[PDB]
Amino acid sequence: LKTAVFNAARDGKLRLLTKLLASKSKEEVSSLISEKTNGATPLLMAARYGHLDMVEFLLEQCSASIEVGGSVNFDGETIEGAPPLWAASAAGHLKVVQSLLNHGASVNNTTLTNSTPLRAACFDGHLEIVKYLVEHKADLEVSNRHGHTCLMISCYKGHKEIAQYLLEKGADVNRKSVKGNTALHDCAESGSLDIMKMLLMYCAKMEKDGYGMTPLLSASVTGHTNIVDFLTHHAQTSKTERINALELLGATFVDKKRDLLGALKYWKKAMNMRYSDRTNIISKPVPQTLIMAYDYAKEVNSAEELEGLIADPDEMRMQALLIRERILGPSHPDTSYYIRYRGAVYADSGNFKRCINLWKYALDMQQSNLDLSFAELFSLLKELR
CATH class of the missing domain: 1.25.40.20 (Ankyrin repeat-containing domain)
Structure with missing residues (x-):
């Protein structure tokens, strides 16, 4: 009936x-x-x-x-x-x-x-x-159970008119979600350099989230070069924060964009800033120990250690895993994700030893830094209406 x-x-x-x-x-x-x-x-x-x-x-x-x-x-x-x-x-x-x-x-x-x-x-x-x-x-400021505001989701989806209108009507540009995310991060993750510029018109402050990430680093992880290029000359970012972002962006070029020549370009920019003021040179930090998964590799430390690299794709792949663990750390899901990615490419090409070691390392990482999976595969939070 x-x-x-x-x-x-x-x-x-x-x-x-x-x-x-x-x-x-x-x-x-x-x-x-x-x-x-x-x-x-x-x-x-x-x-x-x-x-x-x-x-x-x-x-x-x-x-x-x-x-x-x-x-x-x-x-x-x-x-x-x-x-x-x-x-x-x-x-x-x-x-x-x-x-x-x-x-x-x-x-x-x-x-x-x-x-x-x-x-x-x-x-x-x-x-x-x-x-x-x-x-x-x-x-304007009632948010969902994660603290994602209207302005936030409008920036994430790249809606400039709506974001402008919300700012015009008094929306608070500096809201933090429960995970510490700000609308400036949603600009970074979507490559909305336009809306990022507009948020800065309202003196939007650039902060870390719960994961420790600034929008500048968040744009490097997700690969949006327009943001990373824009922020390497913004006075609200420091010299070593610019260096690391270019270097992490290079990692994204090696592993996400599969583009060695783009990666070397950004690694060279980062290298120059490191060695631009001879009275205060930014040396690469030194990890606790060499890592079998990374083939016992070491990050390049001079502009010339970068030249003999492009004919050496494997060293660049290992540079990217090293750079990523250094900057993002073992808790960011991208680190283990791209270790496993790397292991998978090696499996496809033939060295299963490299593969398993990477996969073993990633599992020890995923399990030692505790509070995605291989079966699952055989960010989603922000697409919640």
Whole structure:
């Protein structure tokens, strides 16, 4: 019975439901409206799929399913506890949002992950819904259960207009998530040099997160050269922080971009800064010990130890593992990840001894620095709406 009233609400057939709602009274017309049809409610599905004409009629019958959290689907994943206003926002259904609000829907009702209607419109970038929600008393600084703000997710998805608008309306540029992440990091991870420049217009301070990473280092890990190039001349970064970032960027060039000539370019830049002031030379730190996994290798220490490298791809591969463990450390997932990557390439090429040693080392790293896997494979946090 009601399983039929709801599948026409989802699919949007408005003529059918009007005749099924003429063959029943106004007291039980509310019981079918408060359905459990595949976890959602007739009013929720009516908002997720933008059926404005039928959402307005659904509400003239009973405005009591209006803050109900049910199940919705986006990008294949499924979201629990999403109210209808939130879902109308994530989908871009601007006029469904306006109608939902004119009938007195809370602009502050979130999903179970505590994602506001405002944050939902920021994900896919619906600027006009964002403006409307802000004008209807949305709170710029309610974040999800991880502390990811609207401004943050807007920077991560590269939405300059929306990020600008949120800053214009007074959003705090220096929020830290629970993991210590700031909107400046989301600019770094997305290569949004534009939005990074705009955040700096509001004196955005450049900090480490829980993992110890600055945006400058975060841009090096994820490989966005425009950020790393931009920040090697920003006065808010020190000399050895520039050096390390260029050097770590080189590692990303060797292992992530598979580009030895790009890597040497950045390693040379880093080398010059190290040996630019002869009265204070930045020597490479010296690890506790040589590592079998790294073939007992040692980081280059002079501009000329860099020249005889390009004809030696293996030394560069071992340089990159060394540089990464030095800068990122054993706790950053990229270190073990690229050790295992490296081991895998060696397996493919023939030396299984190199492979197993790298894989053994990575497991001892993954297990000795404790609080991804090979089967799993046979960041995701920020794509949460």
